[PDB]
Amino acid sequence: SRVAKAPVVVPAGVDVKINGQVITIKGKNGELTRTLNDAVEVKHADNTLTFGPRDGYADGWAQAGTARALLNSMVIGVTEGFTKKLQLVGVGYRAAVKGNVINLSLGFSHPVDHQLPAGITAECPTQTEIVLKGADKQVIGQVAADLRAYRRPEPYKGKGVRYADEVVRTKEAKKK
Amino acid sequence: KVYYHHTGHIGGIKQATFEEMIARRPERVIEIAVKGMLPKGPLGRAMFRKLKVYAGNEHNHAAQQPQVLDI
Amino acid sequence: MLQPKRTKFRKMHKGRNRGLAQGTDVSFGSFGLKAVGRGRLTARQIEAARRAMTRAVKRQGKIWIRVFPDKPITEKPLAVRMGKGKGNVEYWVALIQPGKVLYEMDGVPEELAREAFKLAAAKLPIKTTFVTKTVM
Amino acid sequence: MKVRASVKKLCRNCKIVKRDGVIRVICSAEPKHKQRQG
Amino acid sequence: ALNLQDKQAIVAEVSEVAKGALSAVVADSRGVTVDKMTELRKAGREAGVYMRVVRNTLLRRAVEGTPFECLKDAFVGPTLIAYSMEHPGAAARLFKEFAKANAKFEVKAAAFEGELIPASQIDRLATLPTYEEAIARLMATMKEASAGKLVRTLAAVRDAKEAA
Amino acid sequence: AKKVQAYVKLQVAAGMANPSPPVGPALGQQGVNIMEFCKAFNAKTDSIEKGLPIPVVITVYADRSFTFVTKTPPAAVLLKKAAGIKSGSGKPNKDKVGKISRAQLQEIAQTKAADMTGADIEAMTRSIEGTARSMGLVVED
Amino acid sequence: MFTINAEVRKEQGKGASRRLRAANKFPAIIYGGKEAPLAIELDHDKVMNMQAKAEFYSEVLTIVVDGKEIKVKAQDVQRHPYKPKLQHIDFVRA
RNA sequence: CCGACUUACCAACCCGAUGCAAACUGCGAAUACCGGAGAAUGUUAUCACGGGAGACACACGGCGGGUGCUAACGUCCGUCGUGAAGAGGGAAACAACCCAGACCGCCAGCUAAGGUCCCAAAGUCAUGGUUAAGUGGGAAACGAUGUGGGAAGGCCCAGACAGCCAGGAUGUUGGCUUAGAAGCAGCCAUCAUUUAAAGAAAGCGUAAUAGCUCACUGGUCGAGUCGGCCUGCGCGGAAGAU
RNA sequence: GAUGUCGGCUCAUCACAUCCUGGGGCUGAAGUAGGUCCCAAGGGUAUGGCUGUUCGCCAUUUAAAGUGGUACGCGAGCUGGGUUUAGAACGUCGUGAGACAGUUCGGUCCCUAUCUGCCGUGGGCGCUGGAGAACUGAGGGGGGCUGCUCCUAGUACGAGA
């Protein structure tokens, strides 16, 4: 990775704690906002993060790009707050939030019992739009992954749960 | 090596799983690692009967206080 | 099959070798397909390979063929007990030997001839090599 | 998907990725070209 | 070069004109969204001003290896360069034509015959000059700013619409 | 996937934008209604000629909004007009169904200069030359 | 037209030539007239890819061995019966 | 009426270049063989005639060919190790393999084929590269940017390489056709334009239009990367009766 | 000096490339449905007839009527039906004796289990002085299948059904 051989700059008040192959990021965090890298040593200084050698997995630079992506993500995380825009295509499915639960369906009265930890919260403007709120980049996408694990976006009208990189072509009914 | 045995089935054969062994006391994983390292039938049995393992880090079957050992 | 009218005689001994039975270098053009292994061709495979090269290259360049079926081969069918004489003549066989180059070209650009030989190597029973000549 | 071996591409680019020890071919905007084998 | 000439070609190409050029302007708008990009090409052939889009890496290598027009750090991140080799006043006129579909706050700074012209000054330069009215304003700026009154000796064509 | 790609084509009259079959099916699919398009397109198309098709090129966001750029009359309509035709040849450079003067071609060039990028008044002309050649019109003096 | 290397050598037999191919070197010879040629070792690859074009064979070569320089161009070639790499090459003085 | 100017094409003898052969030949080894003469060794290997035969039914395998599909633990012939007609070492073992040739004794040593974490006798060996798959320690076609080294080479800090993002352009929905007919249903134009960059488009896709991948441009971005070819390791290909 | 057959009955058993419900990609899949389609040994996996019958032909049950192996599973299980079984003799052929997998009539099939397994069952011994009583789970199998309609639900989608 080109980018583990150039340092990554850290604002004022962002505390990036180096104690082992775990590095733990605080500033103005909703939660435990943290980074896992093994093959590199990252010292904090206090204004800029410095990348150098440690031991790791047998693939070439296995963790040194990993440390670059993850450090910058978590640092943007505690400051401004990470992205929050979740959505679904189709109607007749619900997207109604009640507390820490998201009510979704295939066609059925009962909820699908999709539930969230303490660390994060939601609300919904409309019955297709979900706002997830937090500071750790991983967990917001882990409840998004679970939401797509009962109905997905698949090409026939395109209907489903949409989040990050999307794998669907949005086909229609056939006519020849 | 998931240690199949005859025990009566239909359609297939019934088996013990590697997965069962952990849920029913921690010993059995450790146990079929030292068993399989001993010879033949009878000698491998005379050797075997000198091992004890149990639940591990909590087991009463240690009250003797033996000779302590690190390997 | 892309086979000869008559070579030698009509019914003939199979043709085993302990090493080289001729053909191992480039002999025309600027490039070709080398075998780097050994085995039989029933002429059907030569044809199949020729079709592939003619479908990729079209009019751009002519083909020089550096192999042909030499020896007729009998079969005694899998319906009757072996040990008593010699079967009907069934196919003409080309004996490919190790590093025998099969087909050569120069008319068409290098990448058309190289690609045309990759298609031809799927019709063949071994793993092969593009071979370059430039003049000699 | 099918038991199609060999991990040659099907579109001008695919994400070529070794999942659970079998290399899958799949496009970056399409689920159609997902193949179980390669 | 023989894989891609396009990327090697562009380094020589800024460096030639930017040594060459009486005014150039180093601005931020990125090498995406065709609508603003087309309009800065379009009006640029009218006023007699040429525009290239160039990385800050290419731009820093063009100042390292070759003489430039004195905007040696005025490039930051994704950066476009509009430049005139014969008519300095057109260079400032093109952003005032181009803000009618996007913006004018896009300039970071400008240069004029070796002098730094900031991003507040160019809004004065741009008010329908021909080459002589641009030149005239650069002398009116200096004359003001230099405290000696030997520095003033002509206004009757040097500070008119006449030849300057 | 997200509809964040490439300048989408449409070329339509002001009253040819109320039904769907003249337009093609695509706007409906990208989250734009035939009625909202029709109202938005007349805003910049009836400022000029409306009885013939004005070219329009569209960008669509992942949030089901749209932007559209509306232009003056196409050089391609003008070349039909100035030549006395409504139809071309369907086999250009091999069959020729009329002719256009060069001095006239430059006035067509100038009418399309509201949106043309060519550095000389000839450069604009040389782009609509191949437009004339496509429609079976011979470019002569 | 290329700049290649040689160390001076003479061998006899299959075993010797194979002992060169064991450490990724192989032999060559330099003729002219009807006399005792200049016998050399070469490297496998320093003469195969420089040879992937007709300029190797149409133009003359700077071949350096123990301060001797003589000028030579390629002649007909001997290739392995399982690799495209060069088993033995000929040269004429030019 | 007789006769005839008049090759446009095919595919030969032939001709040049190119490929090939037990039963074809312009050329032709290595090795084997004999008798002498010499070293060495063999308690006769070989010779006469008299008494006794047995074997002629061989088998998994080296060397090579025919028969067979360059299938078969296949079949046969000249040639040979082992079993036949010999203990031991090693192989989950065996008739037959590899090392090796059982006088007999030796709580002796060494070396072989084969081994060195326990089983089990000896290396979790010192030093480095790589696979995530129990591959290793189960096989081919076959493919790919699965991973690394190496010389030659293109690119290569002047910005690569590959992808992800965003753009994919000005005339332009060019002409016909048509639900519309847009680079991508079909076909003809097959170009020009400001440019730093955008083919009137390589591939996919409700067949289109749409949606989508693509170099190139600019972000991520400042160091390796990829094509041919030699090479260790990987992948799926590799589903059947305690 | 015996690895011995068809056909019927009984009794099984294992491989999953599963007849089916079940989770899931695709589709030239709108949805319903199907094609395409992977995991899966867990479990239910049909029968009477004629015929010595495989295979056949036919009626049918159940939501349903699968593939493969087993000395072509199982005469140290059963009958002994089948081939001229051994017998005429019809049909057939040769001079005849004799033959025929066309055929019709009825028609000789053994083993009390040594070791081995499989399931049920007792004696004797270690259980740490002996005795009686409850008893933990190291270990290991069984239910396991599958339709109907009420609700789920006339709703998303589609032109409409």
Swiss-Prot record, chain A:
InterPro entries, A to Z: Ribosomal_uL6-like, Ribosomal_uL6-like_a/b-dom_sf, Ribosomal_uL6_a/b-dom, Ribosomal_uL6_bac-type, Ribosomal_uL6_CS
Keyword set includes ATP-binding: no
Record PTM N6-acetyllysine, positions in chain: 43
UniProt keywords, alphabetically: Acetylation, Antibiotic resistance, Ribonucleoprotein, Ribosomal protein, RNA-binding, rRNA-binding
GO BP terms in the entry: cytoplasmic translation; response to antibiotic; ribosomal large subunit assembly
One Gene Ontology CC term in the entry: cytosol
Gene3D superfamilies in alphabetical order: Ribosomal protein L6, alpha-beta domain
GO molecular-function term, one example from the UniProt record: structural constituent of ribosome
Oligomer status and interactors: Part of the 50S ribosomal subunit.
Listed HAMAP family: Ribosomal_uL6_B
Entry's family note: Belongs to the universal ribosomal protein uL6 family.
Function text: This protein binds directly to at least 2 domains of the 23S ribosomal RNA, thus is important in its secondary structure. It is located near the subunit interface in the base of the L7/L12 stalk, and near the tRNA binding site of the peptidyltransferase center. Gentamicin-resistant mutations in this protein affect translation fidelity.
Entry protein name: Large ribosomal subunit protein uL6
Organism of this sequence: Escherichia coli (strain K12)
Record lineage: Bacteria, Pseudomonadati, Pseudomonadota, Gammaproteobacteria, Enterobacterales
From Swiss-Prot, chain B:
UniProt KW keywords: Ribonucleoprotein, Ribosomal protein
One Gene Ontology cellular component: cytosol
Highest taxon above the source species: Bacteria
Single GO biological process annotation from the record: negative regulation of translation
Disulfide bonds: none
GO-annotated molecular function: large ribosomal subunit rRNA binding; mRNA 5'-UTR binding; mRNA binding; structural constituent of ribosome; zinc ion binding
Assembly description: Part of the 50S ribosomal subunit.
Known role: This protein is one of the early assembly proteins of the 50S ribosomal subunit, although it is not seen to bind rRNA by itself. It is important during the early stages of 50S assembly.
Family statement drawn from the similarity comment of this UniProt entry: Belongs to the universal ribosomal protein uL13 family.
Protein's name in the database: Large ribosomal subunit protein uL13
Section covered of the full-length record: 72 to 142 of 142
From Swiss-Prot, chain D:
Listed GO CC annotations: cytoplasm; cytosolic large ribosomal subunit
UniProt xrefs under Pfam families: Ribosomal_L36 (PF00444)
GO MF entry, a single one: structural constituent of ribosome
PROSITE patterns assigned to the protein according to its UniProt record, in alphabetical order: RIBOSOMAL_L36 (PS00828)
InterPro entries: Ribosomal_bL36, Ribosomal_bL36_sp
Membrane-spanning intervals of the chain: none
Biological process, per Gene Ontology: cytoplasmic translation; translation
Domain of life: Bacteria
Keywords: Ribonucleoprotein, Ribosomal protein, RNA-binding, rRNA-binding
Job description of the protein: One of the last ribosomal proteins to be assembled in the 50S subunit, it contacts a number of helices in the 23S rRNA, acting as molecular glue. The simultaneous presence of uL16 and bL36 probably triggers ObgE's GTPase activity and eventual dissociation from the mature 50S ribosomal subunit.
Subunit structure and binding partners: Part of the 50S ribosomal subunit.
Family: Belongs to the bacterial ribosomal protein bL36 family.
HAMAP family: Ribosomal_bL36
Protein name: Large ribosomal subunit protein bL36A
Source organism of this protein record: Escherichia coli (strain K12)
UniProtKB/Swiss-Prot annotation, chain F:
GO molecular function list: large ribosomal subunit rRNA binding; rRNA binding; structural constituent of ribosome
Sites of N6,N6,N6-trimethyllysine modification: 3, 39
Gene Ontology process terms (BP): cytoplasmic translation; ribosomal large subunit assembly; stringent response; translation; translational termination
Keyword Ribosomal protein recorded: yes
Domain of life: Bacteria
Pfam families in alphabetical order: Ribosomal_L11 (PF00298), Ribosomal_L11_N (PF03946)
N,N,N-trimethylalanine sites (modified residues): 1
Assembly behavior: Part of the ribosomal stalk of the 50S ribosomal subunit. Interacts with L10 and the large rRNA to form the base of the stalk. L10 forms an elongated spine to which 2 L12 dimers bind in a sequential fashion forming a pentameric L10(L12)2(L12)2 complex.
NCBIfam families: L11_bact
Entry's family note: Belongs to the universal ribosomal protein uL11 family.
Free-text function comment from the UniProt entry: Forms part of the ribosomal stalk which helps the ribosome interact with GTP-bound translation factors.
Protein name: Large ribosomal subunit protein uL11
Gene: rplK
